[PDB]
Ligand binder design. Structure first.
Ligand SMILES: Cc1nc(Cl)sc1C(=O)Nc1cccc(Oc2ccc(NC(=O)/C(C#N)=C(\O)C3CC3)cc2)c1
Ligand SMILES: Cc1cc2nc3c(=O)[nH]c(=O)nc-3n(C[C@H](O)[C@H](O)[C@H](O)COP(=O)(O)O)c2cc1C
Ligand SMILES: O=C(O)c1cc(=O)[nH]c(=O)[nH]1
Length: 365
């Protein structure tokens, strides 16, 4: 399509020349919440439909956490064509995050490095914002367009588990699923909440809080992990997740590694790297987690997805759903239709009836 080329070759490179990445991000959020977005032409095929996490998803392509941190653009994102939307991370109290600049483009690598540090409007602001459209969301969810809420912790917080517990109580009733983000590279000490006995403590408390919500307001609970885990970390996570009955895994967050071959001038900036250089590390982590959980724990695959083939590789590796964030900053909105359309053509070619049949297919052949 000419739409896709025009955004990739002209529109998005123009935006890059005009604005720094954080301004571009804020402008995008503003324009999305106003509904100012091109054609919704591609009507979703039945092949793209997935049933997982106690819900129907019209299509398996979601927007990853971080684009809509404060829940301002949910409806614009469904209009863009995403089959589900995740907001956050949201922290209990408002906070500024790190000083600017904090986000950096690596156009040669199709990569971004960010160190936002959980800038959040806080639970209360986000709660009221989601309450204003709650019934609208209940009809979207019923129509196969679910909402996820990603939870983080405040910087100065003494008690990590309590920050997540507050998030469960406040935003849990408003979410189809919740994400315990234990994998941000940009809050000190946060990533070691991924070691055994302390991860069992934390998730036990989270699941207890969740179980104490009323039935129609009781969301699925997922854990979001980094691509930088040791084999030991991964084995411990799989074990805790099976023992406790966690509903699923999001795989993966951004990486603190800098793979050999990055060209961008800004490659040595502190922060998490996303986009194309993260793609295969993330696919390999999906593959490992799926095998370690015996295919019993639904996985949302994320990291460098920018085409139907990328999405299909994650699905075949064991993802039931996928997300993207960085691709959108290089291709703009038409990237959503592109990934859906290529994913559907590839499923026909490899002889799958729908997305469901492809899930984990690499582990059976
Ligand atoms: C206004 C309008 N009028 C017509 Cl007629 S079509 C159209 C349009 O293209 N709308 C539109 C609206 C919202 C986002 C968008 O595309 C995006 C999506 C994401 C980003 N984000 C970034 O560029 C970006 C960067 N760099 C980031 O998000 C940084 C933080 C990672 C920018 C534009 C495009
Ligand atoms: C600017 C930016 C902000 C992000 N913020 C968050 C966040 O708040 N919480 C979270 O769990 N992930 C966050 N992520 C990670 C994305 O959700 C996704 O896991 C990661 O970027 C890999 O996907 P991608 O390569 O498609 O961008 C962020 C990523 C970027 C680029
Ligand atoms: O806010 C951030 O810095 C952030 C959080 C997160 O989970 N992942 C990421 O790349 N950045």
């Amino acid at each position: 399509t000419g739409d896709e080329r025009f955004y990739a070759e002209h529109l998005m490179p123009t935006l890059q020349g005009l604005l720094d990445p954080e301004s571009a991000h804020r402008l995008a959020v503003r324009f999305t919440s106003l509904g100012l977005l091109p054609r919704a032409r591609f009507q979703d095929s039945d092949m793209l439909e997935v049933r997982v996490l106690g819900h129907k998803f019209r299509n398996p392509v979601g927007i990853a956490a971080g684009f809509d941190k404060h829940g301002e653009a949910v409806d614009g994102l469904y209009k863009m064509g995403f089959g589900f939307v995740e907001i956050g991370s949201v922290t209990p109290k408002p906070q500024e995050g790190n000083p600017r600049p904090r986000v950096f483009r690596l156009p040669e690598d199709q990569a971004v490095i960010n160190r936002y540090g959980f800038n959040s409007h806080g639970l209360s602001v986000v709660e009221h914002r989601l309450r204003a459209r709650q019934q609208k969301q209940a009809k979207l969810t019923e129509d196969g367009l679910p909402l996820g809420v990603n939870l983080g912790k405040n910087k100065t917080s003494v008690d990590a588990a309590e920050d997540y517990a507050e998030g469960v109580r406040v935003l849990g009733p408003l979410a189809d699923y919740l994400v315990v983000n234990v994998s941000s590279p940009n809050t000190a000490g946060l990533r070691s909440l991924q070691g055994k006995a302390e991860l069992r403590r934390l998730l036990t408390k989270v699941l207890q809080e969740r179980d104490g919500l009323r039935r129609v307001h009781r969301p699925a609970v997922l854990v979001k992990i980094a691509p930088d885990l040791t084999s030991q970390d991964k084995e411990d996570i799989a074990s805790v997740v099976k023992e406790l009955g966690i509903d699923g895994l999001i795989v993966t967050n951004t990486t603190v590694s800098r793979p050999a071959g990055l060209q961008g001038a800004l490659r040595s900036e502190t922060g998490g790297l996303s986009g194309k250089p993260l793609r295969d590390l993330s696919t390999q982590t999906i593959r490992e987690m799926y095998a370690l959980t015996q295919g019993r724990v639904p996985i949302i695959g994320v990291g460098g997805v920018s085409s139907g083939q990328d999405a299909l590789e994650k699905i075949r590796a064991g993802a039931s759903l996928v997300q993207l964030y960085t691709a959108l900053t290089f291709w703009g909105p038409p990237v959503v239709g592109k990934v859906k359309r290529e994913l559907e053509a590839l499923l026909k070619e490899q002889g799958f009836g729908g997305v469901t049949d492809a899930i984990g297919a690499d582990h059976r052949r």
